[PDB]
Amino acid sequence: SFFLVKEKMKGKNKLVPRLLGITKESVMRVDEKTKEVIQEWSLTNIKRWAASPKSFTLDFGDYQDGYYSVQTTEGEQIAQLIAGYIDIILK
């Protein structure tokens, strides 16, 4: 399942197209121009998340030092997908 998100870079302020690949074990970001993976995070390391109409704040435990917040069109669908995957692992 692929979702259209936008990422902002430090120094400037502009929204640019980006590809995000989500799986049942881990989350990873793919570049639209080079078609390669830059950085990835584990599914069990996520603590909390904010589901906003335009933005989406992702909070990580002992993995990411900085912050990761991208612009999503379907924030309610992504939040429900992550919650369901955690329920299957606990059972």
Binding site: K8, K10, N13, K14, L15, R48, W49, A50, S52, P53, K54, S55, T57, D59, D65, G66, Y67, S69
Partner: protein, 174 residues
């Protein structure tokens, strides 16, 4: 504060850019400061008053954003007046947002509104950028005419998104 173009406002925009840039850096480092418990609880305001202060400012910002857009492309002598207004409201917004950052800890919206204000001031930075170019002069700003439309639509994008958190923050932060 130099005028490389040919109008009043070029000065005001660049001088404000210096100030706004300073609050961008503060909010940029406050994003990682508030999460590491390295931030002091607000500056001098309560929790519901944050919703008051911030929302009241945001509305009046948007209020002036439209007349500023009109001014930036043509109203040179008026543009400076709009800029004065826009920049001043963002100061308490920064303070209030940094306040809410360290002070609020009930819902995950704490770091959400902090980013909605961070990218909001960033959109205001790009705003004074295009306005500096086009200010009162559509000629040496042919493409800037289109860039100004990208800066105004970028601002309202974070404005409507911030208000969503403010109104819920009544019970979501209170």
């Amino acid at each position: 504060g130099i005028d490389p173009f040919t109008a009043p406002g070029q000065l005001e925009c660049e001088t404000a850019i210096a100030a706004l840039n300073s609050c961008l850096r503060d909010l940029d480092q406050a994003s990682l400061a508030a999460v590491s418990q390295q931030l002091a609880p607000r500056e001098g305001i309560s929790q519901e008053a944050l919703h008051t202060q911030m929302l009241t400012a945001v509305q009046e910002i948007s209020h002036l954003i439209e007349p500023l857009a009109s001014a930036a492309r043509a109203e040179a002598s008026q543009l400076g007046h709009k800029v004065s207004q826009m920049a001043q409201y963002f100061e308490p917004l920064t303070l209030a947002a940094v306040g809410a950052a360290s002070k609020t800890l009930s819902h995950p919206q704490q770091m959400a509104l902090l980013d909605q204000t961070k990218t909001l001031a960033e959109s205001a930075l790009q705003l004074l950028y295009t306005a500096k170019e086009a200010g009162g002069n559509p000629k040496q700003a042919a493409h800037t005419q289109e860039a100004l439309e990208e800066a105004v639509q970028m601002m309202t994008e974070a404005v409507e998104d911030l208000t969503t958190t403010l109104n819920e923050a009544a019970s979501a932060a209170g």
